[PDB]
Design a protein around this ligand. Structure first.
Ligand code: NA
Ligand code: NA
Length: 327
DNA sequence: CCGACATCGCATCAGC
DNA sequence: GCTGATGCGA
DNA sequence: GTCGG
């Protein structure tokens, strides 16, 4: 499927999706439009009518009428009006600032704050997260070429091993699946001293070292198991400096680590196709564990896992290389 | 007709 | 001071 | 908004 097949429609649905999330605060309508947008984007035919599209799972009556109006006229009245609307368009835009959700955005617009410049005029009303999001608004909406990711990975794996050679670190996300670009860097971290039935300084030590060598620049949130922050590759010689990037680091217990690796590697569609197939065999798989369903649906104790493949084994399916986990 | 639609770590607010 | 709810991103 | 109990 190409973009210009049904791109006018998927852009329409995606636009409608954002206004539901950010302005109407209806998260379930948000995913409804996105699910419809996805299944249409995978549809290998140019859609002739709403009735044709309605045959797809996730496409109901209301969207069918909208596709008709778009197909027949080239636009959607409801969408045209909400675009022109000063309140709604401003509320929607502000949510693109990381740290500002639907709730904070509506508050700002309620008291006159509508633009990036308005935000810059009123920084004492922003929390720490929002300021970082404001500071790197442009940088956060850029994607990361795989070449820069590989360089980013080099630093992380190096500094992690430098703190303690027994750490195990894995950069997951679409990067691990071989993608040419990424939205952020997701790092998964474990250590033989950290199990389920188990120091709560393991994560701090790694974060601080990446701060010492000036890879990590800012902090959005940091706890005993999860870090969310900002990082930046060093500038080359006389070259232009790199954009600031989003990076996450999770500390996961050893016995839940490979369930964690598998889950955050994805993709989302793969994980459900895999979850579905998993239950047919009588197993339940989440981010943390793989558990055996009883005769009545009760969960047995979490099964031993020492690799990604161990999980694939449990449910009678051959190991899949990350590059072939798009679905 | 009507509930499900995934769930959780961290920051910060609402309330005691 | 604390506990729980909520917002946010994922 | 869509699906299904
Ligand atoms: Na349908
Ligand atoms: Na945001």
């Amino acid at each position: 499927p190409q973009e210009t097949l049904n791109g006018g429609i998927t852009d329409m649905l995606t636009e409608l999706a954002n206004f539901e999330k950010n302005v109407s605060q209806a998260i379930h309508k948000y995913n409804a439009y996105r699910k419809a947008a996805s299944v249409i984007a995978k549809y290998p035919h140019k859609i002739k009518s709403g009735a044709e599209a309605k045959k797809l799972p996730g496409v109901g009556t209301k969207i069918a009428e909208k596709i008709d109006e778009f197909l027949a006229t080239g636009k959607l009245r409801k969408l045209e009006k909400i675009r022109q609307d000063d309140t709604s368009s401003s509320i929607n835009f502000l949510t693109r600032v990381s740290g500002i959700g639907p709730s904070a955005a509506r508050k700002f617009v309620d008291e006159g704050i509508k633009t990036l410049e308005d935000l810059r005029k009123n920084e004492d009303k922003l929390n720490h997260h929002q300021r970082i999001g404001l500071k790197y608004f442009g940088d956060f909406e850029k994607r990361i070429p795989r070449e820069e990711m590989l360089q980013m990975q080099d630093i992380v794996l190096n500094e992690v091993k430098k703190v303690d050679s027994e750490y195990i670190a894995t950069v997951c996300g679409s990067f691990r699946r071989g993608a040419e670009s990424s939205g952020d860097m997701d790092v998964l971290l474990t250590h033989p001293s950290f199990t389920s039935e188990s120091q709560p300084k393991l994560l701090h030590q790694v974060v601080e070292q990446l701060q010492k060598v000036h890879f990590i620049t800012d902090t959005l949130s940091k706890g005993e198991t999860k870090f969310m922050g900002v990082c930046q590759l060093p500038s080359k010689n006389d070259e232009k400096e790199y954009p600031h990037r989003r990076i996450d680091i999770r500390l996961i217990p050893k016995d839940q680590y490979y369930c964690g690796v598998l889950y955050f590697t994805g993709s989302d569609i793969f994980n459900k196709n895999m979850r579905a197939h998993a239950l047919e065999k009588g197993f339940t798989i989440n981010e943390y564990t793989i558990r055996p369903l009883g005769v009545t649906g009760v969960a047995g104790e979490p099964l031993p896992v020492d690799s990604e493949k161990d999980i694939f084994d449990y449910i009678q399916w051959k190991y899949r290389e990350p590059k072939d986990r798009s679905e």
